[PDB]
Every structure is written in structure tokens, then in C-alpha cells.
Short mmCIF file of C-alpha atoms and ligand atoms in Angstrom, two decimals:
data_model
loop_
_atom_site.label_atom_id
_atom_site.label_comp_id
_atom_site.label_asym_id
_atom_site.label_seq_id
_atom_site.Cartn_x
_atom_site.Cartn_y
_atom_site.Cartn_z
CA UNK M 160 62.98 93.60 114.62
CA UNK M 161 64.40 90.82 112.51
CA UNK M 162 62.73 87.97 114.30
CA UNK M 163 60.01 88.43 111.41
CA UNK M 164 62.15 88.25 108.53
CA UNK M 165 64.13 85.07 109.91
CA UNK M 166 61.57 82.55 108.85
CA UNK M 167 62.59 80.34 111.85
CA UNK M 168 66.17 80.18 110.64
CA UNK M 169 67.75 82.79 113.17
CA UNK M 170 70.31 80.00 114.17
CA UNK M 171 71.62 79.32 110.67
CA UNK M 172 71.26 83.02 109.73
CA UNK M 173 72.89 84.35 112.93
CA UNK M 174 75.79 81.95 112.46
CA UNK M 175 76.45 82.48 108.70
CA UNK M 176 76.25 86.26 109.49
CA UNK M 177 79.05 85.92 111.97
CA UNK M 178 80.93 83.46 109.67
CA UNK M 179 80.87 85.96 106.68
CA UNK M 180 81.79 89.35 108.62
CA UNK M 181 84.28 87.26 110.36
CA UNK M 182 86.06 86.68 107.04
CA UNK M 183 85.59 90.18 105.62
CA UNK M 184 86.59 91.99 108.74
CA UNK M 185 89.40 89.29 109.34
CA UNK M 186 90.86 90.27 105.76
CA UNK M 187 90.22 93.84 106.87
CA UNK M 188 92.25 93.81 109.94
CA UNK M 189 95.24 92.18 108.32
CA UNK M 190 95.22 94.56 105.38
CA UNK M 191 94.68 97.48 107.63
CA UNK M 192 97.65 96.39 109.56
CA UNK M 193 99.88 95.82 106.55
CA UNK M 194 98.80 99.26 105.12
CA UNK M 195 99.41 101.10 108.44
CA UNK M 196 102.81 99.48 108.74
CA UNK M 197 103.72 100.41 105.12
CA UNK M 198 104.40 96.89 104.13
CA UNK M 199 103.72 95.13 100.71
CA UNK M 200 101.21 92.41 101.05
CA UNK M 201 102.78 89.51 98.91
CA UNK M 202 106.21 90.36 100.37
CA UNK M 203 104.59 89.88 103.93
CA UNK M 204 103.30 86.74 102.55
CA UNK M 205 99.46 87.63 102.34
CA UNK M 206 97.55 85.94 99.77
CA UNK M 207 96.03 88.78 97.99
CA UNK M 208 95.04 87.03 94.94
CA UNK M 209 92.90 84.54 96.90
CA UNK M 210 91.29 86.97 99.20
CA UNK M 211 90.63 89.37 96.33
CA UNK M 212 88.78 86.52 94.48
CA UNK M 213 86.95 85.30 97.57
CA UNK M 214 85.64 88.71 98.79
CA UNK M 215 84.88 90.02 95.08
CA UNK M 216 81.35 88.40 94.81
CA UNK M 217 80.60 89.71 98.05
CA UNK M 218 81.67 93.11 97.44
CA UNK M 219 79.62 93.31 94.25
CA UNK M 220 76.40 92.29 96.17
CA UNK M 221 77.13 95.17 98.68
CA UNK M 222 78.00 97.55 95.89
CA UNK M 223 74.83 96.55 94.00
CA UNK M 224 72.70 97.16 97.10
CA UNK M 225 74.59 100.59 97.93
CA UNK M 226 73.87 101.72 94.57
CA UNK M 227 70.87 100.40 92.85
CA UNK M 228 71.13 100.64 89.09
CA UNK M 229 74.85 99.54 89.22
CA UNK M 230 73.66 95.87 88.08
CA UNK M 231 77.32 94.99 88.27
CA UNK M 232 77.61 91.30 87.03
CA UNK M 233 80.77 89.24 87.20
CA UNK M 234 81.65 87.75 83.78
CA UNK M 235 84.53 85.84 82.27
CA UNK M 236 85.97 85.23 78.94
CA UNK M 237 86.10 81.59 77.36
CA UNK M 238 89.77 81.27 78.13
CA UNK M 239 88.73 81.71 81.71
CA UNK M 240 87.09 78.27 81.53
CA UNK M 241 90.23 76.29 80.50
CA UNK M 242 91.96 75.12 83.60
CA UNK M 243 95.26 74.76 81.57
CA UNK M 244 96.01 78.32 80.84
CA UNK M 245 94.14 80.28 83.72
CA UNK M 246 96.10 81.10 87.00
CA UNK M 247 92.98 81.27 89.00
CA UNK M 248 89.39 79.98 88.35
CA UNK M 249 86.64 82.51 87.75
CA UNK M 250 85.07 84.06 91.01
CA UNK M 251 81.98 82.31 92.45
CA UNK M 252 78.74 83.33 90.58
CA UNK M 253 80.67 84.53 87.53
CA UNK M 254 78.95 83.84 84.28
CA UNK M 255 80.31 83.00 80.72
CA UNK M 256 79.69 86.07 78.43
CA UNK M 257 78.15 83.89 75.70
CA UNK M 258 75.72 82.61 78.35
CA UNK M 259 75.06 86.07 79.53
CA UNK M 260 74.32 87.77 76.23
CA UNK M 261 72.03 84.96 75.43
CA UNK M 262 69.89 84.92 78.62
CA UNK M 263 70.46 88.32 80.03
CA UNK M 264 67.17 90.41 80.11
CA UNK M 265 67.69 93.50 78.09
CA UNK M 266 68.87 96.52 79.99
CA UNK M 267 71.92 98.25 81.35
CA UNK M 268 74.85 96.40 83.14
CA UNK M 269 78.33 96.96 84.53
CA UNK M 270 80.90 94.08 84.79
CA UNK M 271 84.14 92.94 85.79
CA UNK M 272 85.56 90.48 83.02
CA UNK M 273 87.92 87.74 83.89
CA UNK M 274 90.08 86.36 81.29
CA UNK M 275 91.64 83.70 83.42
CA UNK M 276 94.57 85.74 84.55
CA UNK M 277 93.42 89.46 84.36
CA UNK M 278 90.22 91.49 85.03
CA UNK M 279 88.86 94.41 83.35
CA UNK M 280 85.79 96.66 83.69
CA UNK M 281 83.09 97.00 81.35
CA UNK M 282 79.80 98.79 80.52
CA UNK M 283 77.29 96.76 78.80
CA UNK M 284 73.93 97.90 77.06
CA UNK M 285 71.55 95.05 75.93
CA UNK M 286 68.28 95.88 73.95
CA UNK M 287 66.42 94.83 70.77
CA UNK M 288 68.90 96.49 68.36
CA UNK M 289 71.86 94.36 69.91
CA UNK M 290 74.41 94.39 72.60
CA UNK M 291 77.13 97.23 72.99
CA UNK M 292 80.04 97.21 75.30
CA UNK M 293 82.56 99.67 76.56
CA UNK M 294 85.51 97.89 78.20
CA UNK M 295 87.92 99.84 80.24
CA UNK M 296 91.12 98.01 81.17
CA UNK M 297 93.25 99.16 84.17
CA UNK M 298 96.27 97.61 82.92
CA UNK M 299 98.31 99.01 79.86
CA UNK M 300 101.67 97.40 79.66
CA UNK M 301 101.84 96.15 76.01
CA UNK M 302 104.98 97.54 74.48
CA UNK M 303 103.51 97.71 71.00
CA UNK M 304 99.97 99.11 70.64
CA UNK M 305 98.97 96.22 68.18
CA UNK M 306 97.93 93.85 70.89
CA UNK M 307 95.25 96.24 71.84
CA UNK M 308 93.89 95.70 68.38
CA UNK M 309 93.67 92.07 69.31
CA UNK M 310 92.19 92.59 72.37
CA UNK M 311 89.45 94.97 71.05
CA UNK M 312 88.67 92.23 68.43
CA UNK M 313 88.92 89.39 71.08
CA UNK M 314 86.50 91.19 73.28
CA UNK M 315 84.01 91.74 70.43
CA UNK M 316 84.20 88.07 69.38
CA UNK M 317 83.38 87.08 73.00
CA UNK M 318 80.19 89.08 72.95
CA UNK M 319 79.11 88.34 69.54
CA UNK M 320 80.04 89.69 66.03
CA UNK M 321 76.80 91.81 66.05
CA UNK M 322 77.92 93.59 69.26
CA UNK M 323 79.08 97.18 69.03
CA UNK M 324 82.50 97.34 70.99
CA UNK M 325 84.85 99.63 72.31
CA UNK M 326 88.26 98.84 74.02
CA UNK M 327 89.81 101.34 76.22
CA UNK M 328 93.27 100.49 77.74
CA UNK M 329 94.31 102.80 80.66
CA UNK M 330 97.65 103.02 82.43
CA UNK M 331 96.41 102.54 86.07
CA UNK M 332 97.77 99.38 87.29
CA UNK M 333 101.52 98.86 88.12
CA UNK M 334 101.40 95.81 90.64
CA UNK M 335 100.45 92.29 89.69
CA UNK M 336 97.53 91.74 92.01
CA UNK M 337 95.31 94.95 91.98
CA UNK M 338 93.36 94.47 88.95
CA UNK M 339 90.12 93.41 90.76
CA UNK M 340 89.88 96.47 93.08
CA UNK M 341 90.64 98.62 90.17
CA UNK M 342 88.23 97.01 87.96
CA UNK M 343 85.55 97.13 90.46
CA UNK M 344 86.31 100.94 91.11
CA UNK M 345 86.22 101.57 87.34
CA UNK M 346 82.73 100.04 87.35
CA UNK M 347 81.41 102.16 90.03
CA UNK M 348 82.75 105.28 88.08
CA UNK M 349 80.92 103.97 85.14
CA UNK M 350 77.70 104.06 86.91
CA UNK M 351 78.79 107.52 88.32
CA UNK M 352 79.15 108.62 84.44
CA UNK M 353 76.11 106.68 83.43
CA UNK M 354 74.94 109.50 81.01
CA UNK M 355 78.31 110.07 79.35
CA UNK M 356 78.74 106.20 78.76
CA UNK M 357 75.07 105.99 77.42
CA UNK M 358 76.01 108.68 74.92
CA UNK M 359 79.08 106.66 73.82
CA UNK M 360 76.97 103.59 73.28
CA UNK M 361 74.69 105.70 71.22
CA UNK M 362 77.52 107.06 68.95
CA UNK M 363 78.83 103.37 68.82
CA UNK M 364 75.56 102.21 67.18
CA UNK M 365 75.47 105.20 65.00
CA UNK M 366 79.10 108.78 64.38
CA UNK M 367 82.22 110.35 65.39
CA UNK M 368 83.74 109.48 68.81
CA UNK M 369 85.35 112.98 69.11
CA UNK M 370 82.15 113.96 71.28
CA UNK M 371 83.08 110.99 73.76
CA UNK M 372 86.96 110.19 73.38
CA UNK M 373 90.26 111.92 72.22
CA UNK M 374 91.83 109.24 70.16
CA UNK M 375 89.97 106.25 68.53
CA UNK M 376 90.44 103.75 65.62
CA UNK M 377 88.24 100.98 64.17
CA UNK M 378 89.93 97.59 63.68
CA UNK M 379 90.44 96.03 60.42
CA UNK M 380 89.03 92.81 61.32
CA UNK M 381 85.69 93.37 63.11
CA UNK M 382 85.48 97.20 62.93
CA UNK M 383 85.60 97.30 66.91
CA UNK M 384 86.58 100.35 68.51
CA UNK M 385 90.04 100.78 70.13
CA UNK M 386 90.43 103.83 72.17
CA UNK M 387 94.09 104.69 72.98
CA UNK M 388 92.98 108.06 74.56
CA UNK M 389 89.82 107.79 76.63
CA UNK M 390 89.59 111.40 77.85
CA UNK M 391 87.12 112.93 78.52
CA UNK M 392 85.22 109.66 78.91
CA UNK M 393 88.18 108.47 80.96
CA UNK M 394 88.35 111.44 83.40
CA UNK M 395 90.26 112.32 86.56
CA UNK M 396 87.83 110.51 88.83
CA UNK M 397 88.74 107.43 86.71
CA UNK M 398 92.60 107.93 87.28
CA UNK M 399 92.51 108.38 91.25
CA UNK M 400 93.79 105.08 92.03
CA UNK M 401 96.75 105.23 89.45
CA UNK M 402 99.51 103.64 91.28
CA UNK M 403 102.55 105.20 89.60
CA UNK M 404 102.79 109.03 90.11
CA UNK M 405 104.37 109.24 86.79
CA UNK M 406 101.02 107.96 85.07
CA UNK M 407 98.81 110.29 86.92
CA UNK M 408 101.41 113.46 85.97
CA UNK M 409 101.59 112.18 82.26
CA UNK M 410 97.88 111.90 81.98
CA UNK M 411 97.59 115.57 83.66
CA UNK M 412 100.19 116.76 81.22
CA UNK M 413 98.17 115.43 78.25
CA UNK M 414 94.96 116.63 79.69
CA UNK M 415 95.62 119.82 81.67
CA UNK M 416 91.90 120.60 81.95
CA UNK M 417 91.62 117.59 84.37
CA UNK M 418 94.02 119.00 86.69
CA UNK M 419 91.60 121.36 88.52
CA UNK M 420 88.45 119.44 88.80
CA UNK M 421 87.41 117.84 92.34
CA UNK M 422 87.73 114.18 92.52
CA UNK M 423 86.05 113.90 95.79
CA UNK M 424 84.03 115.95 98.35
CA UNK M 425 87.22 117.24 100.13
CA UNK M 426 87.94 119.18 96.76
CA UNK M 427 91.03 117.64 96.07
CA UNK M 428 92.51 117.77 92.64
CA UNK M 429 93.80 114.49 91.03
CA UNK M 430 97.50 115.61 91.77
CA UNK M 431 96.67 116.45 95.26
CA UNK M 432 95.09 113.23 96.15
CA UNK M 433 97.76 111.14 94.62
CA UNK M 434 100.62 113.05 96.40
CA UNK M 435 98.73 112.36 99.77
CA UNK M 436 98.89 108.66 99.00
CA UNK M 437 102.58 108.43 97.88
CA UNK M 438 104.43 105.81 100.15
CA UNK M 439 107.89 104.47 99.76
CA UNK M 440 108.56 100.72 100.27
CA UNK M 441 110.08 97.54 99.11
CA UNK M 442 108.03 95.59 96.41
CA UNK M 443 108.70 92.12 94.82
CA UNK M 444 110.86 92.31 91.52
CA UNK M 445 109.17 91.36 88.29
CA UNK M 446 117.60 91.69 89.03
CA UNK M 447 118.82 91.53 91.40
CA UNK M 448 116.76 90.65 93.44
CA UNK M 449 113.64 89.53 94.87
CA UNK M 450 112.90 93.08 95.97
CA UNK M 451 113.26 96.79 94.95
CA UNK M 452 112.42 99.93 96.66
CA UNK M 453 109.74 102.10 94.94
CA UNK M 454 107.72 105.30 95.61
CA UNK M 455 103.88 104.90 94.43
CA UNK M 456 100.35 105.57 95.35
CA UNK M 457 98.97 103.11 97.87
CA UNK M 458 95.37 104.28 96.86
CA UNK M 459 94.27 101.03 95.58
CA UNK M 460 95.40 99.25 98.92
CA UNK M 461 93.42 101.98 100.75
CA UNK M 462 90.30 101.36 98.54
CA UNK M 463 90.43 97.46 99.11
CA UNK M 464 90.14 98.37 102.80
CA UNK M 465 87.44 100.98 102.40
CA UNK M 466 85.44 98.46 100.38
CA UNK M 467 85.80 95.50 102.92
CA UNK M 468 84.66 98.13 105.44
CA UNK M 469 81.41 98.74 103.47
CA UNK M 470 80.74 95.08 102.96
CA UNK M 471 81.16 93.87 106.61
CA UNK M 472 78.72 96.78 107.53
CA UNK M 473 76.21 95.80 105.00
CA UNK M 474 76.22 92.24 106.29
CA UNK M 475 75.75 93.23 109.89
CA UNK M 476 72.36 94.80 108.96
CA UNK M 477 71.47 92.88 105.83
CA UNK M 478 68.27 90.76 105.63
CA UNK M 479 68.72 86.99 105.92
CA UNK M 480 68.31 86.32 102.23
CA UNK M 481 71.25 88.40 101.56
CA UNK M 482 73.35 86.80 104.32
CA UNK M 483 72.37 83.41 102.87
CA UNK M 484 73.49 84.51 99.38
CA UNK M 485 76.73 85.82 100.73
CA UNK M 486 77.47 82.91 102.84
CA UNK M 487 77.07 80.65 99.85
CA UNK M 488 79.15 82.83 97.53
CA UNK M 489 81.90 82.53 100.15
CA UNK M 490 81.38 78.59 100.38
CA UNK M 491 81.40 78.40 96.51
CA UNK M 492 84.75 79.95 96.49
CA UNK M 493 86.27 76.73 97.78
CA UNK M 494 85.02 74.81 94.64
CA UNK M 495 86.78 74.53 91.44
C1 COA Y 295 106.57 100.23 83.50
C2 COA Y 295 106.26 98.64 84.06
C3 COA Y 295 106.16 97.79 83.05
C4 COA Y 295 107.59 98.41 84.91
O1 COA Y 295 108.23 99.69 85.24
P1 COA Y 295 109.90 99.86 85.38
O2 COA Y 295 110.11 100.29 83.96
O3 COA Y 295 110.53 98.42 85.58
O4 COA Y 295 110.00 101.02 86.42
P2 COA Y 295 109.98 100.78 87.94
O5 COA Y 295 109.96 99.31 88.33
O6 COA Y 295 111.00 101.47 88.73
O7 COA Y 295 108.61 101.42 88.29
C5 COA Y 295 107.85 102.19 87.46
C6 COA Y 295 106.73 102.97 88.12
O8 COA Y 295 105.52 102.21 88.34
C7 COA Y 295 105.63 102.06 90.05
N1 COA Y 295 105.73 100.61 90.35
C8 COA Y 295 106.35 99.64 89.82
N2 COA Y 295 105.97 98.37 90.22
C9 COA Y 295 104.96 98.80 91.13
C10 COA Y 295 104.36 97.96 92.11
N3 COA Y 295 104.42 96.37 92.17
N4 COA Y 295 103.20 98.58 92.98
C11 COA Y 295 102.95 99.80 92.80
N5 COA Y 295 103.73 100.65 91.81
C12 COA Y 295 104.58 100.05 91.04
C13 COA Y 295 106.84 102.64 90.43
O9 COA Y 295 106.58 103.25 91.49
C14 COA Y 295 107.20 103.66 89.10
O10 COA Y 295 106.49 104.78 89.34
P3 COA Y 295 107.20 106.24 88.80
O11 COA Y 295 107.62 106.08 87.43
O12 COA Y 295 106.12 107.29 88.92
O13 COA Y 295 108.39 106.37 89.72
C15 COA Y 295 105.08 98.60 85.12
O14 COA Y 295 103.82 99.13 84.32
C16 COA Y 295 104.59 97.37 85.40
O15 COA Y 295 105.37 96.68 86.44
N6 COA Y 295 103.58 96.58 84.93
C17 COA Y 295 103.40 95.14 85.38
C18 COA Y 295 101.93 95.02 85.59
C19 COA Y 295 101.63 93.49 85.88
O16 COA Y 295 102.42 92.85 86.40
N7 COA Y 295 100.48 92.94 85.37
O1 IHP Y 296 83.28 105.36 94.10
P1 IHP Y 296 82.63 104.90 95.38
O2 IHP Y 296 83.21 103.65 95.95
O3 IHP Y 296 81.38 104.92 95.29
O4 IHP Y 296 83.23 106.12 96.63
C1 IHP Y 296 83.26 107.47 96.44
C2 IHP Y 296 84.92 107.91 96.32
O5 IHP Y 296 85.73 106.73 96.19
P2 IHP Y 296 87.14 106.60 95.28
O6 IHP Y 296 88.49 107.09 95.75
O7 IHP Y 296 87.43 105.14 94.75
O8 IHP Y 296 86.78 107.42 94.05
C3 IHP Y 296 85.54 108.89 97.32
O9 IHP Y 296 86.55 108.51 98.05
P3 IHP Y 296 88.10 109.38 98.28
O10 IHP Y 296 88.32 110.40 97.12
O11 IHP Y 296 88.19 109.88 99.58
O12 IHP Y 296 89.27 108.25 98.18
C4 IHP Y 296 84.39 109.69 98.33
O13 IHP Y 296 84.88 109.92 99.49
P4 IHP Y 296 84.89 111.69 99.91
O14 IHP Y 296 84.04 112.55 98.85
O15 IHP Y 296 84.26 111.86 101.47
O16 IHP Y 296 86.43 112.32 100.08
C5 IHP Y 296 83.04 108.70 98.66
O17 IHP Y 296 83.18 107.79 99.43
P5 IHP Y 296 82.64 107.72 101.25
O18 IHP Y 296 81.44 108.72 101.30
O19 IHP Y 296 82.12 106.37 101.68
O20 IHP Y 296 83.72 108.03 102.07
C6 IHP Y 296 82.44 108.44 97.13
O21 IHP Y 296 81.10 108.12 97.21
P6 IHP Y 296 79.77 108.38 95.96
O22 IHP Y 296 80.70 108.73 94.44
O23 IHP Y 296 78.81 107.30 95.90
O24 IHP Y 296 79.25 109.81 96.33
#
């Protein structure tokens, strides 16, 4: 019974519980309906950017509780604090990296890093020796691979010049609004490959990345690591939600050994699973005009739905202090 754990607040708790599940499940029902009807959300006038920003802090709480040791913390870069450049304010509970590095208790963390307009995933190690970070970006649209040099340097400068850093840009995202669900999934995959990421942190502080990645280079300015080929650290299980079939196939062509390993309990290969998620629909054009018809994997929209399902279930059976916390995180999203 929960009457013992309610501290006489069963009225406020029970009402905040309904309020949070109502929003999570309310978003779930529309997204499930749009996905089942094979319709693009932004063409259907669903404001995914705002829903993804409001549910994210609540998803992390659920994921942190579902997998202890994930230690997933939302963080943002300095440019995210600038109301002039940013397209959206950082999500509720988000911390400035400088504040985090200075005050975070030593240990292992996962993170989603908002720069104001885009979000990446990260694996952070903080101890006496220093802080080290492995950043995986689900977007790779830069035409010339020199912006990644800047990104790697820009990420290192945000964590401190004494931090060891690796920047891994990966061709997963194709849409404009999926960078939050993709980064959240990469974080979960990081905790899944915890051992492999710890051995990379070790090599970062000490030799040859060849035991961990296929292609890497130190940057001229800060000597941070830029990885333009993350395999095998970036394996098939990290490429599952690649939206373009050409990205998954190019990746498998470059790393054939990843084409036969199981990516889930159903024993699907990366290629089998992506094919199962291929849909054909109209999307917004980013000549002429407005829309274009494409064939892509709806894995991310299915994953957004599956994550909302998890969170809504967690809250239904969550203890009051968790309910209070998630209700506040939702209210805090209407600030800024
Ligand atoms: C390559 C890129 C720059 C544009 O692609 P393009 O040259 O114009 O060619 P297309 O628009 O026909 O699409 C390219 C591929 O990505 C897919 N794609 C394009 N836009 C997509 C979208 N909004 N959602 C899901 N998939 C998309 C397409 O299905 C296509 O896959 P395919 O090669 O397996 O057939 C793409 O990476 C992109 O749109 N990046 C923007 C990311 C962002 O907005 N931030
Ligand atoms: O990474 P998680 O969020 O922790 O969930 C993953 C995973 O999800 P991803 O697609 O993002 O990698 C699988 O999902 P699918 O391949 O089917 O899409 C899987 O499912 P199955 O093995 O049953 O096929 C199962 O999730 P669940 O048990 O809730 O259905 C699994 O969980 P774990 O990695 O924690 O074991």
C-alpha cells in the first residue's frame, strides 16, 4: 500500500500523478496515431520540438530508475544560455557543463548535450586525474570534415582544457527534429557498452585508439580526439535507428562484420531490422516545394513511442517523491 509513503499528501500526489501520465500518455496517443497512419508529425502540425523538450527530463528520470548506473544527466553548452542564437531553451533541470564539471561528484555519467539548437550524446568520466568525455553526435551533415575539428575543440573547451575528449560524429539523423530521442538512445547504448567505453577513456588518458576505433586524429589546437570512424566502439546496436537506409547499408558495407550480429532478442541483424522499419511518406522539404516523398526508417518515431510507454508506466507505480519530481520538471518546462 502507498498510504504509508504518501505523507498525508495523497491528494496532491494523486492529482499530480494523473497530470503527468495524462501528458505523457496524451503525447503517446497522438504520436501512436500519427505513426500508425504513416504521417509525418510536423506536416501534421504536431509540435514535436516542444513535446520532445517537455518529456525529455521525465524520460531521463524513468531511464535512470529503469537502469541504475546510467547516471544520465542533461547538460548544455554555453551557447545554449544565449537567448539570441538558440532555437529553444535548455530542457528543465539542465546544467551548464562548467557548473557540472566544477561541482559534480566524481564518477561515471551519461549525458545529452544541448548546444541551443542541437543535441548530442556523451559518456563522461570524472575522477582525481581529471574529466574525460566521449561524445557521439547522431548528426553528420557537414560537407567538409573540418567543422568536426572545430566541434571536437569546441567540446573540449567547454569541459576544460585539462579534459581528455573524443568527438564521434555519426550519420544517424536525417530529419530535423529527432536529435533528442536519438541522443537518449545513444546514451542508453553507452551504458550498455559501459566496459568498451571505459577502455576508451583509459586509452584517452594514456595509447593507440586502434583497439577502440577504426579512424581517429588529434586536433592541432587542443589535441582532442576526432573520430571519423567509430567502429567498433560505434557498433550495429548504435546504428539501429539510422533513418536513411543508405546510411545503414553504407555502414554495413564499410563494416561487414557488423552485418550478422544480433541487434535485439528477436535475433534480427541491423539490415533486417532497418528493412522492417522502412516506410514511404511525404516529409517537409529542407524546391519545389513544401513537401517531398521519401522512403526511410521510422525507427525513431517508434522509439519515441516506446519510451513514452515506459515513462507512463513508471509514473503509475512510482513513489510520491518521484511523482513530485516529475510534476515539477513538467511545470519547469513552461519557464524561460
Ligand atoms: C543528406 C541530407 C543532407 C539531405 O539528403 P538529400 O541529398 O537531399 O537527399 P534526400 O532528401 O532524397 O534524402 C536522403 C536520404 O535521407 C532520408 N531522409 C531525408 N530527409 C529525411 C527526413 N526528414 N526524415 C527521415 N529521412 C529522411 C531519405 O529517405 C534518403 O534516404 P536514402 O538515401 O536511403 O534513400 C540529409 O542528411 C539531411 O536532410 N540532413 C539534415 C539534418 C538536419 O536537418 N539537422
Ligand atoms: O536500449 P533500451 O532502451 O534499453 O531497449 C532495448 C532495445 O531498444 P532499441 O531499439 O533502442 O535498441 C530493443 O528494442 P528493438 O530492437 O525491438 O527495437 C529490445 O527489444 P527486444 O530485444 O525484445 O526485441 C529491449 O527493449 P524491451 O524489452 O522493452 O522490448 C532492449 O532492452 P535492454 O537493452 O535493456 O535489454
